[PDB]
Design an enzyme around this catalytic site. Sequence first.
Site, short mmCIF file in Angstrom:
data_model
loop_
_atom_site.label_atom_id
_atom_site.label_comp_id
_atom_site.label_asym_id
_atom_site.label_seq_id
_atom_site.Cartn_x
_atom_site.Cartn_y
_atom_site.Cartn_z
N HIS A 184 62.48 -45.31 69.23
CA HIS A 184 62.73 -44.05 68.68
C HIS A 184 61.30 -43.32 68.73
O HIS A 184 61.41 -41.91 69.06
CB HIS A 184 63.15 -44.23 67.08
CG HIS A 184 63.36 -42.76 66.57
ND1 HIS A 184 64.50 -41.99 66.23
CD2 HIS A 184 62.43 -42.13 65.87
CE1 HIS A 184 64.21 -40.76 65.57
NE2 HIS A 184 62.84 -40.83 65.44
N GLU A 185 60.46 -43.87 68.01
CA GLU A 185 58.96 -43.20 67.89
C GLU A 185 58.66 -42.83 69.21
O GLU A 185 58.02 -41.57 69.39
CB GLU A 185 58.13 -43.77 67.03
CG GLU A 185 58.65 -43.91 65.69
CD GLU A 185 58.93 -42.66 64.63
OE1 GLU A 185 58.46 -41.62 65.07
OE2 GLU A 185 59.64 -42.70 63.67
N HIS A 188 59.65 -39.58 70.90
CA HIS A 188 59.21 -38.28 70.49
C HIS A 188 57.98 -37.86 71.41
O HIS A 188 57.85 -36.68 71.75
CB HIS A 188 58.70 -38.29 69.16
CG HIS A 188 59.70 -38.27 68.04
ND1 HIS A 188 60.74 -37.15 67.93
CD2 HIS A 188 60.00 -39.31 67.11
CE1 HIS A 188 61.20 -37.35 67.00
NE2 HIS A 188 61.11 -38.62 66.20
ZN LIG Z 1 61.84 -39.33 64.68
#
Ligand SMILES: [Zn+2]
Length: 388
Positions: A184-185, A188
């Site tokens: 997820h991170e 980004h």
């Molecule tokens: Zn996030």
Amino acid sequence: ADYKVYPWGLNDPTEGSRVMIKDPWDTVASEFTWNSDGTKKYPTTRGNNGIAQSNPSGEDDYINNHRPRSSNLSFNYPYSPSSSPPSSYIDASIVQLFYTANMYHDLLYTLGFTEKTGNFEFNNNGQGGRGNDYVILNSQDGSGTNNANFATPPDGQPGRMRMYTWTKSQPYRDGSFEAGIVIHEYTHGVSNRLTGGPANSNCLSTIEAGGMGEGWGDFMATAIRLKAADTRAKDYTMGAWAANDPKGIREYPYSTSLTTNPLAYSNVDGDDSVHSIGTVWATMLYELMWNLIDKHGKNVSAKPTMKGGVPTDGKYLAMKLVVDGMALQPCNPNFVQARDAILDADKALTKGANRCEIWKAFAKRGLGYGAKYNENKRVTSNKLPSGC
Ligand SMILES: [Zn+2]
Ligand SMILES: *[C@@H]1O[C@H](CO)[C@@H](O[C@@H]2O[C@H](CO)[C@@H](O[C@@H]3O[C@H](CO)[C@@H](O)[C@H](O[C@H]4O[C@H](CO[C@H]5O[C@H](CO)[C@@H](O)[C@H](O)[C@@H]5O)[C@@H](O)[C@H](O)[C@@H]4O[C@H]4O[C@H](CO)[C@@H](O)[C@H](O)[C@@H]4O[C@H]4O[C@H](CO)[C@@H](O)[C@H](O)[C@@H]4O)[C@@H]3O)[C@H](O)[C@H]2NC(C)=O)[C@H](O)[C@H]1NC(C)=O
Ligand SMILES: [Ca+2]
Ligand code: NA
């Protein structure tokens, strides 16, 4: 090099066991391996794609922070989720974080996120873009709890991931072992770099675009964890292990059931939470992914088969179309524009072979033909275009 880790595709320690993995890099995507930058070979968790370490103080220095040293690059350290406190297995934690982030670098490279498109590497080997921008990977970062975060500057300055400890359980749970949170991170970084081109990192700054920002990471995490036995009837939560909550951290599970997960584009109206909006977007993408898997089949190995630059299986095709869409969409996109970018990515990749599968997924949840963005009151549609 040997890495003792939960293998790629295991979302968290509940899904399987750690094993020793030899030389897990892709030689094409990581031509210096993970443990070199073309200048120096490092006997630790440092190389062309990232530098990992603990960060107990929670400050910004990283170069001299702790990381495990092994002169034969045998990164085999103890860990059990029953162990406590987290500091007692920081070495295993750093190695898992490094492993997951480098595996993701390599997959993303295969999908087209390379030096010239604005990826994160120290030495770009003259392949275009700006180097010096591997990911700084902090484990057990002391600047917070029960979360994680990623900072994405323009191409040529490092991304920074901070993984925290979770305190919703005893023992505490170390987020570096939840691959879905790492993925997820890192996503980004991918979405901020690709959107609006690698020099502009402010292109997901509106509420709706920031919402997709959260959803893309939940989607990629969910796609990576799919198992061979899964069908579209499988539901997946987000961060359930780290948060110690079977519902995970979003309002509903990712599901193709409109009962289990009723989200639609109208649920973005009035929504001030990018994580909430991102749940709507990731749910639409889960729909898309399963339309493509049902059509093309699933590859649940760590590398897609590519025929003429097109993944042969639906899971990797979904990931490819989503990543391609990021590079096509306008700066600060809305959901309609992001949808259209995925459609255009498929026009470019397959001459529009997946038009109907894409429209059906989005139309199911209110982003069909005739849907319109409005800051306050969106126009929803379950309609399909001619032929679908
Ligand atoms: Zn996030
Ligand atoms: C990268 O680097 C790291 C180093 O940092 C490497 O990791 C280290 O790996 C070694 C294993 O190779 C670890 O050593 C083991 O440590 C545990 C305790 O933590 C010990 O139980 C174990 O002890 C056995 O082995 C040693 C060393 O064996 C070597 O040298 C011998 C001659 O000196 C040679 O014959 C042998 O084949 C090896 O080349 C030995 O001296 C001990 O007696 C013991 O061996 C006996 O027992 C084992 C079963 O445990 C048998 O398999 C073995 O054949 C021996 O059996 C005889 O004796 C028995 C009675 O004791 C009898 O019942 C049998 O019949 C037989 O006669 C090791 O010391 C080390 O701790 C690791 N790291 C750290 C943090 O130190 C890593 O491998 C390396 N990786 C790569 C890819 O290169
Ligand atoms: Ca770069
Ligand atoms: Na490279």
